[PDB]
Design a protein around this ligand. Structure first.
Ligand code: 530
Length: 341
């Protein structure tokens, strides 16, 4: 049966939610912290803003719901609930998404300081465990950074936000964790972009400092190539962008630096893993599954406790539909939702 809904204005927006959700408080569509009286969980409730205003927006709403409904893993943000106050498809215009409330993000944890090697092991282990799962469903995060890695008091981690030009401009953390092939659109990229991001994050946990804090795209590329070396003939061929390939060749060649001299005092196993993650040629980067079996994670690794995902049908991604068609599909997904045990 349909629960009773009550109304409240919070972010100059009217939130209409089931009675079970109490003490709604803004934290950041708009997001509110709340207490789910049915489960006893502290939750985050996200109300999507104008979910069906255009074809692009309607498809994005469907995409986010499909992604969240699929993810069922300890280290990945999943759906506790999804609801609409609408009683029918014709009334349907708002979507609310509910997940676990996490206390902080990784930026709050690092706070300009070094973490202990054990803390780094545990945090990177969980990220990679979550990524193995996400990647196994043929999903790419594409935008991994400390701000979308949420953590509780016990350092337990979940991945958020998986799946404009102005905000990528300049001295900005929005670009610092991006693989060079996507920052400069070198080629058709794949899952390996996420491993680059993990490398950048891991380095920052170890040193307390941004690995590649570029002041712009070009400055960042220079910082990258100084560490990992300029591309060889092999990688150059794979840069399908003739323009990008042409620019790359104009740069003075540089050898790969010694990572042990860059990361002074770090666990030699951490240095080794960083060398395997921060490879310029994406074809040759370590995968999440391979990284989990690396000696650095010896105390956490368990091949029987690192699950993969059920098949994820994303044929909708190459489909062209009307607004009302994406809207109907979204409605079907809301109505059919089954809460976790
Ligand atoms: F179903 C969802 C999916 C993602 C959502 O977005 C979101 N945003 C944020 C959080 C959060 N905590 C953040 C962590 C970073 O600092 C601010 C609070 N815990 N859970 C969260 N979920 C959401 F609210 C509902």
């Amino acid at each position: 049966e349909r629960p009773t809904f009550y109304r409240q204005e919070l972010n100059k927006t009217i939130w209409e939610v089931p009675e079970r959700y109490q003490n709604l408080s803004p934290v950041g569509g708009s997001v509110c912290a709340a207490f789910d009286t049915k489960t006893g969980l502290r939750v985050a409730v996200k109300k999507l803003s104008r979910p069906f205003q255009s074809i692009i927006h309607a498809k994005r709403t469907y995409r986010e719901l499909r992604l969240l409904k699929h993810m069922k893993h300890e280290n990945v943000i999943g759906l506790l609930d999804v609801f609409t106050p609408a009683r029918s498809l014709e009334e349907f215009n708002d979507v609310y998404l509910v997940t676990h409330l996490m206390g902080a993000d990784l930026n709050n944890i690092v706070k300009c300081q070094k973490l202990t090697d054990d803390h780094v092991q545990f945090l990177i282990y969980q990220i990679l465990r979550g990524l193995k799962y996400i990647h196994s469903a043929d999903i790419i995060h594409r935008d991994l950074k400390p701000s979308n890695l949420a953590v509780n008091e016990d350092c337990e981690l979940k991945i958020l936000d998986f799946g404009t030009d102005d905000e990528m401009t300049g001295y900005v953390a929005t670009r610092w964790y991006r693989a060079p092939e996507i920052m400069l659109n070198w080629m058709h990229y794949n899952q390996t972009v996420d491993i680059w991001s993990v490398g950048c994050i891991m380095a920052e946990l170890l040193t307390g400092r941004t690995l590649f804090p570029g002041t712009d795209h070009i400055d960042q590329l220079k910082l990258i190539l100084r560490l990992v070396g300029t591309p060889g003939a092999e990688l150059l061929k794979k840069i399908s962008s003739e323009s990008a390939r042409n620019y790359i060749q104009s740069l003075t060649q540089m050898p790969k630096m010694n990572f042990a001299n860059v990361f002074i005092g770090a666990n030699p196993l951490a240095v080794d893993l960083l060398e395997k993650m921060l490879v310029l040629d994406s074809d040759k980067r370590i995968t999440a599954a391979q990284a989990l079996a690396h000696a650095y994670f010896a105390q956490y690794h368990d091949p029987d406790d690192e699950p993969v995902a059920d098949p994820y049908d994303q044929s909708f991604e190459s489909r062209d539909l009307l607004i009302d068609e994406w809207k109907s599909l979204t409605y079907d997904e809301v109505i059919s939702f089954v809460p976790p045990p």
